[PDB]
Structures are given as C-alpha cells and as structure tokens.
Amino acid sequence: DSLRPKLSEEQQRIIAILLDAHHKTYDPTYSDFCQFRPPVRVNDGGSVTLELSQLSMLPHLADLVSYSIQKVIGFAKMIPGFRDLTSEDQIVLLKSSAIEVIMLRSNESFTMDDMSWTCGNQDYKYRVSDVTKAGHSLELIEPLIKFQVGLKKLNLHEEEHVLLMAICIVSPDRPGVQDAALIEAIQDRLSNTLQTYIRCRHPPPGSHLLYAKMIQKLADLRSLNEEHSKQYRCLSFQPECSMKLTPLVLEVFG
Numbered sequence: 001d002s003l004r005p006k007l008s009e010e011q012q013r014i015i016a017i018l019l020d021a022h023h024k025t026y027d028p029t030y031s032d033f034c035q036f037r038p039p040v041r042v043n044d045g046g047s048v049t050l051e052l053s054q055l056s057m058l059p060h061l062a063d064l065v066s067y068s069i070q071k072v073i074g075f076a077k078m079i080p081g082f083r084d085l086t087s088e089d090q091i092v093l094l095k096s097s098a099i100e101v102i103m104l105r106s107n108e109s110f111t112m113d114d115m116s117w118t119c120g121n122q123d124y125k126y127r128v129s130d131v132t133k134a135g136h137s138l139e140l141i142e143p144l145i146k147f148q149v150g151l152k153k154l155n156l157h158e159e160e161h162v163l164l165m166a167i168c169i170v171s172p173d174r175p176g177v178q179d180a181a182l183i184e185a186i187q188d189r190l191s192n193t194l195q196t197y198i199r200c201r202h203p204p205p206g207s208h209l210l211y212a213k214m215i216q217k218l219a220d221l222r223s224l225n226e227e228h229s230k231q232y233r234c235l236s237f238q239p240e241c242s243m244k245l246t247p248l249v250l251e252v253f254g
C-alpha cells in the first residue's frame with residue numbers, strides 16, 4: 001500500500017499561510033527583548049526562599065511571556081479557519097493554549113549546545129537557573145528541558161513546526177469550548193495537511209511515524225500546562241507578585 005497523496009493546492013495554501021503567519025510573529029533576532037524590564041541575575045547558588053524573596057527574573061520573563069502571548073494571538077488569527085469561530089471560543093482556545101504554544105515556539109531559541117534558550121548573547125541567554133529565579137521549581141523546569149531536547153531531535157521542518165502550533169491551538173478538547181465540531185473540523189484540516197506533508201516531504205527514511213511522535217509532544221504539552229498552572233498559583237501567592245507580572249499574563253493565567 002504505502003500511499004503517498006499529493007498535497008492539495010489548498011493544503012499548500014495552508015502551509016504558505018502558516019509559514020508567513022509565523023515569520024510575521026516570530027522575530028528570529030529577538031530585537032525587541034531590550035525593551036522588556038531588565039534581566040536581574042543575583043545568584044542563589046543552590047534557594048526557594050531567596051528565589052521567592054527576590055523573584056529577580058520575573059519582571060523580565062513575564063514581559064517575555066506577555067509579549068509572546070501577543071504574538072501567539074497574532075499567529076492564531078491567521079490560522080485558516082480560526083476567524084470562523086465565535087470570539088468566545090477564540091478566547092477560550094487562546095487562553096488555554098498560550099503557555100503550550102510559548103513552549104513550542106521557544107523551541108526555536110533553544111539550543112543543544114548548552115541546553116539553553118539563546119536569545120542571546122549573555123543577557124538574553126536563559127538557563128535553568130533563570131527559571132528558578134523567576135520562582136518556578138524543578139518539577140516544571142526539568143520536564144521542560146526534556147521536552148525541548150525531544151522536540152529538537154525531531155528536526156522538524158519549519159512547515160511541521162508551524163503546523164504543530166496551529167494544531168495545538170485549534171483543539172476541540174479544551175475545557176469550556178462551545179462549538180467543538182467546528183474546532184475539530186478546523187483541526188482535522190490541519191492534521192491532514194500535516195500527515196500528508198510528512199509522507200510527501202519528509203526524508204528520513206521509512207517513517208510517516210514522525211506524525212505519531214508529534215502528537216506525543218501535544219500530549220506532553222498538556223502535562224507541562226497542568227504543572228505550569230500549579231506553579232503559577234504558587235507564584236501568585238507571593239505578596240506584590242502582581243507588580244512583577246503584566247495585565248495580560250494575570251488575565252491569561254489568573
């Protein structure tokens with residue numbers, strides 16, 4: 001059997017639209033980052049109390065996340081079909097997917113040279129110790145780095161990378177969606193574009209089985225999101241935490 005259908009004119013269009021959507025909303029130069037409140041890295045050596053006391057990298061990482069949520073919304077608006085949903089569902093989907101899409105999309109600055117996100121030079125190079133200094137614990141960070149490496153190693157084409165983001169976002173099992181059929185319809189259209197792409201275009205050899213691995217990463221993103229939730233709740237109990245966040249971050253993770 002081994003059937004290999006040609007991508008349809010429409011599928012191609014979808015891929016074009018998504019590549020362009022991404023390039024419009026992902027500055028590979030990180031040129032805006034000098035506009036965020038400053039990275040502050042005063043050493044905890046090995047401490048939760050200090051890290052909560054200071055939260056030194058929270059202003060900087062929360063501006064980075066607030067900014068990225070903005071670009072995500074932007075990206076989501078150009079996904080073919082997104083606009084056909086009601087704004088009520090559009091927002092439900094943006095809200096519940098934001099943290100996951102940031103994680104996926106942060107794969108583009110992630111480097112296996114030293115397991116960091118290099119945005120970068122020194123000041124915009126983010127390591128595990130920076131994430132701890134923004135008040136997160138190892139139970140989110142370590143599965144996150146593992147997630148970044150797993151994803152890197154999939155060596156996705158940009159096409160697969162932007163399809164995966166679109167699919168993560170337009171998900172019919174988000175708690176609180178109204179019109180699940182429509183969202184599924186939009187997702188199936190992307191998944192099918194992705195499944196076909198992989199068979200049409202992906203080396204590697206012998207596998208259309210990369211599709212399976214991609215879906216596994218979506219499941220992974222679910223767990224990281226739950227863990228992020230619980231660590232965000234905790235963060236939010238630090239007095240004056242709200243000042244170190246932004247309106248958009250509070251509303252999206254509230």
Ligand SMILES: C[C@H](CCCC(C)(C)O)[C@H]1CC[C@@H]2/C(=C\C=C3C[C@@H](O)C[C@H](O)C3)CCC[C@@]21C
Pocket residue numbers: 058061062064065068102103105106107108109110117119126131134136228232249
């Ligand atoms: C868990 C957190 C986020 C949540 C932090 C709060 C809100 C306090 O809970 C991490 C996810 C990955 C991210 C990192 C980079 C991300 C990039 C850099 C660029 O790729 C451009 C992307 O759009 C975005 C590394 C540092 C840690 C992070 C911020």
